[PDB]
Amino acid sequence: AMRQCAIYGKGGIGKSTTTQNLVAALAEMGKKVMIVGCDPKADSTRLILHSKAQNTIMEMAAEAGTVEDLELEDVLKAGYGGVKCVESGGPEPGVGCAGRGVITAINFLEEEGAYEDDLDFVFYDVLGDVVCGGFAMPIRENKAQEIYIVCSGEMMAMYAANNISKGIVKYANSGSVRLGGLICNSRNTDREDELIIALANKLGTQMIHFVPRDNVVQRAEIRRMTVIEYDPKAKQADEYRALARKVVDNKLLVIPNPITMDELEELLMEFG
């Protein structure tokens, strides 16, 4: 088989950094992994490829004529640990639906046979500030069975987590998309772990891991690397190794229970 997971969360919360470091740690354990970038920024694979970014399926299809003229070997690139990487892309701002490239990319990968039985994991890195268009398609169309949400003690981050959870409930009667857990990407504030644990419990899920704020992440990204590759002895590398182990071992996949604005506010007051 192969596990299909999607990482959601508000912009700037740490989705791409956490996903690429998690995937490097999985490849370091010998897992075969694909990352599919589904955010218009198009930088979701740069740390695996040691690159500035990656050219997107939308840009390459326009240069080649049609998406049918593209071959999989031209779009998929292998980086650190043999992790395979692809970027969806999207239209320019103010033109067309920002999520349109996601639909194009996922359909291309399915028909071109990218989902080979030797893969163990596929990760989709998905914009979560809105849940519509192609950004909802991994949920609507049953492409990502396990959703992991990156958040932090920030009000907006927990609000985004609740909005993603409402989209999961909307489509619960079809396919098998479920919430796998919350990943706290710390802003280095007091009681933050306990906050996110309380939120996960209220949603019906779990906090799968607490990722500390660590400046070694910036020093690695400056050199276009994961912390796993940059400094395998760093304390932060062991954190991503621990996250990877827990994702591999996770068995709780639920239909979440979204909370009200009043419950959210109460959480923040309580944990000060």
Add this chain to the structure above:
Amino acid sequence: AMRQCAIYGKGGIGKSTTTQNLVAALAEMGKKVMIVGCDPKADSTRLILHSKAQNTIMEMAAEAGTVEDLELEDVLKAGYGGVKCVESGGPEPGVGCAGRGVITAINFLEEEGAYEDDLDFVFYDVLGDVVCGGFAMPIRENKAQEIYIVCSGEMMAMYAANNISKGIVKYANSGSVRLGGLICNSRNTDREDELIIALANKLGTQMIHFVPRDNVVQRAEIRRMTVIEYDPKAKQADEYRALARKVVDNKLLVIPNPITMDELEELLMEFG
């Protein structure tokens, strides 16, 4: 006449807090102001109304039958200083385009005569993490002549500012939408003002004001108030009063020059 301005920026950067405090300071000077909430969170008016939030045009139209059964006096609410407030709303997550409520609301307000000649300012509080659908409509349809972008030294915040600027250039051949300036909402880090000044200069615009990080904002929002109403002697209140004066006096409205990813990265390295 009346000035029509739209505030854009990434989620959680401080758009709604800055806009409501700016508007309170304008009303405190005797200006007549309307705020139009264009973000699906629907909390863009709560500090003027002293409310939990505001019921949205989309929700009220569904309760009343059609939008034509709504009257303006039922949708518009007056708060602090006589500021008039309305919220667009939007579909639930995973259903329909998240920006669809913006189009419905702005058309309702135009036809119902909300744009009365006694208004001095209308502010639209617009989600900026994607620039498409109804969230681009203030730019595409020439509703907001002056765009102000809230950002901070955060990479994602400056990337959003550049993406909004690309949307302004896309539509420069029609109407008169222009970039009015950048507002730095501080994360209390070194050289942050100089960073945002450098970015604005590269875009062709200006940093109109630097808003400090101040805990009095949280103490006021806990009581559902602007800092202007909560503590008119606070140092932070004078900051919002200074921002309001500069927005009233601003005459520079330009078609911006979007920058490349390499220029953005260079900025961040330089200013450490």
